[PDB]
Design a protein around this ligand. Structure first.
Ligand SMILES: Cc1cn([C@H]2CC[C@@H](CO)O2)c(=O)[nH]c1=O
Length: 130
């Protein structure tokens, strides 16, 4: 319905806002774009489902997220990808892992403070009805 479409439009507005706030954080710069095809040639062979904040934005705009839970799976993916691909004790790896965890934690904290639980429940019920 028109009302359901307004729901989803509101969802997308909320998700763009959260995603923008993550993307402008200097700590998260490395997650803002996909990893360069040639310049890290082994990435796409270790990491089967690359994800980054620009790809999140495109997915929002393509109406791929019908719930916050679905968005958060992609935030979780950005994180798990970073922990998987940079697993070493070396400071380079430890910095990106820290930053990945901080991205995840920040997104969850923003959502905990600002997402109405009844709004999410609605989204989930509309999705489950399709
Ligand atoms: C997403 C990601 C990026 N990098 C390096 C690749 C080159 C630079 C910018 O992509 O950061 C890296 O070493 N590990 C990663 O998990």
């Amino acid at each position: 319905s028109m009302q359901e479409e307004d729901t989803f439009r509101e969802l997308r507005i909320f998700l763009r806002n959260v995603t923008h706030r993550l993307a402008i954080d200097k700590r998260f710069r490395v997650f803002t774009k996909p990893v360069d095809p040639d310049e890290v040639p082994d990435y796409v062979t270790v990491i089967k489902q690359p994800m980054d904040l620009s790809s999140v934005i495109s997915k929002i705009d393509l109406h791929k997220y019908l719930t916050v839970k679905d968005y958060l799976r992609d935030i979780d993916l950005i994180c798990s990808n970073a922990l998987e691909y940079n697993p070493d004790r070396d400071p380079g790896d430890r910095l990106i892992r820290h930053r990945a965890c901080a991205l995840r934690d920040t997104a969850y904290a923003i959502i905990k403070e600002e997402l109405d639980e009844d709004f999410e429940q609605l989204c989930e019920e509309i999705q489950e009805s399709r």
